[PDB]
């Protein structure tokens, strides 16, 4: 197992200024570095309290990279549908070099209707836009004199600068909450995968992993634990009932932001290992269950939410580092 | 006068790898901070050794912001013609908050044919895309529930997140199109201007400044020296021979890059005060001339070029801070 942190903002200006949010998030990235976490992840979203403080994850991750030395930086996930592959390839290549080779690039599908409407892009061909965006970026990184005759963009021969630091390029992961068939296509392409256990049933995530691992082997490709990412809301306290109360409020706040942006329950989610909330001992048992179902992979611990004090996010990370990180290292 | 540092890359891998360039440029930003320079600036350009290591200046400046405390971060310049105003406003708002209000945003006009070709933008739309892009971004920062229905984009109502740190928005500077209307339009909107003395005759710069200052007065706008930006190649050494030879190589190399991209001169440029290269006493005389011609404004000192070692860029900056910065303070 690998464990990093995810910094998904679910907050609006009435709860926390963006100035405070970004100072706190960069300090949590520093704490991830100091405590020995694997990575720092953030997201791309527009307009709503659900994710909207992060319309450009690369901008945050370049700052996080500059504040850190060893933690990896991960997009979870850039949205190729809303950018141009020349720009996406270029800014990610800059970040790879700034971070001295610590970047992993997750690419995801958009789903918020207001994002599609505002950028005047149809959902109808978003799948083709996504696949062509990923491949065009990969080609801009891997090749020179690139002639891209795409459905949505046509350019070349061109060679994108800067060239990436990593060879052939940063790891590519494809996010799928949608369809196990997209996980098969990722393996066929040699890509990693990002799954969403917090919404999908356990047996569904397992069958997606089985299809992915099967397709990967058929393509002569052995996925490591760094090729499979999943994010979990995470809140730790020495008092597990305090963790339930404050972590449950956080998960509630994020759920509400989500419901607004798309246009008993918490305890069951915790019992089903859809969220990592409790004492270090509760979360240890939960992780061991997850590892038994899914095998070894990379978890991003989502540690911020709403007006949750920085000190509580930092406590979660410190407790995880002291009590859990050593046993999986 | 104010003096900052320009970190425009005119460099390819035979001179510095991208990894070396970004490591050294971030250290120069740290040195600009330490030595008391006003700002750090970088460019947006694609494909060529002329600027092509920086397809996304916000990515670099986010890292530079994270490494520094006081120096301002200036886009010189983002190109609205190649990015959607929603994305431009969002990433810049993130950068504003990450830097805790140290951002000034210069908006530039593209001119390299290869960039227009690759992004599939007709050059005849350059003016409208620029003016509509700048204004849409300004409104996205300044207002809530923004609806924009222009020639190229239609969206809203949206409230762009994160909200900027600076209110109503960061300083906006615009490259002028040498037509009088563009300098007057900047003044009437309360924008600053970015002028190019290294290429245009002194009298042209003076005419644009007169138009800008007069239109500002008529509009009730009082521009300050921080509202007027110009870049100069800069190389200082106490040995005047070394300054001319190495500063000359640096400027000639940058001019070769530009000539490739668009398809006794250096001595003349220095004599006409279009480059700031020489001993500290020689450059002092040059700046005194420029200030007499143009008034007080903000200079970005372009201190890197090609394979010039970091320590020579650092020496230029240290000599400038010791011998010239106090005379204008
Ligand atoms: Ca603080
Ligand atoms: Ca090659
Ligand atoms: Ca080095
Ligand atoms: Ca400039
Ligand atoms: Ca103003
Ligand atoms: Ca300038």
Author numbering:
A (entry chain A), B (entry chain B): 1 to 263, 286 to 351
Describing publication, verbatim:
Rishirilides are a group of PKS II secondary metabolites produced by Streptomyces bottropensis Gö C4/4. Structurally, rishirilide is a tricyclic partially aromatic polyketide with an unusual isopentyl sidechain and a carbonyl group on the third ring. In this study the involvement of one cyclase and two oxygenase in rishirilide biosynthesis was investigated. For this purpose, excision of rslC3 gene using the markerless time-saving CRISPR-Cas9 system, inactivation of rslO4 gene using Redirect® technology, and crystallization of RslO4 and RslO1 proteins were carried out.
The monooxygenase RslO1 crystallizes as a homodimer and the overall structure of each subunit is made up of a well-conserved 8 β-strands TIM-barrel surrounded by 8 α-helixes. Each β-strand connects an α-helix through a short loop region. According to the structural homology study using Swiss Model Server, RslO1 was revealed to be FMN-dependent bacterial luciferase-like monooxygenase. RslO1 belongs to the family of FMN-dependent luciferase-like monooxygenases. The RslO1 three-dimensional structure shows a high similarity to FMN-dependent luciferase-like monooxygenases such as the epoxy-forming MsnO8 which acts with the flavin reductase MsnO3 in mensacarcin biosynthesis in the same strain. The high similarity in three-dimensional structure between RslO1 and the epoxy-forming MsnO8 enzyme in mensacarcin biosynthesis in S. bottropensis indicates a similar activity of RslO1 enzyme in the epoxide formation to form RslO5-substrate during rishirilide biosynthesis in the same strain. According to the high sequence identity between RslO2 and MsnO3 (47%), it is most likely that RslO2 acts as flavin reductase, by using NADH as a hydrogen source, to provide RslO1 with the reduced FMN in a similar mechanism of MsnO8-MsnO3 two-component epoxide-forming system. In his turn the FMN-dependent luciferase-like monooxygenase RslO1 is responsible for the formation of an epoxide providing a substrate for RslO5. Following the epoxidation mediated by RslO1-RslO2 system, RslO1 product undergoes an epoxide reduction by RslO5 and then oxidative carbon backbone rearrangement including RslO9-mediated Baeyer–Villiger oxidation and lactone formation.
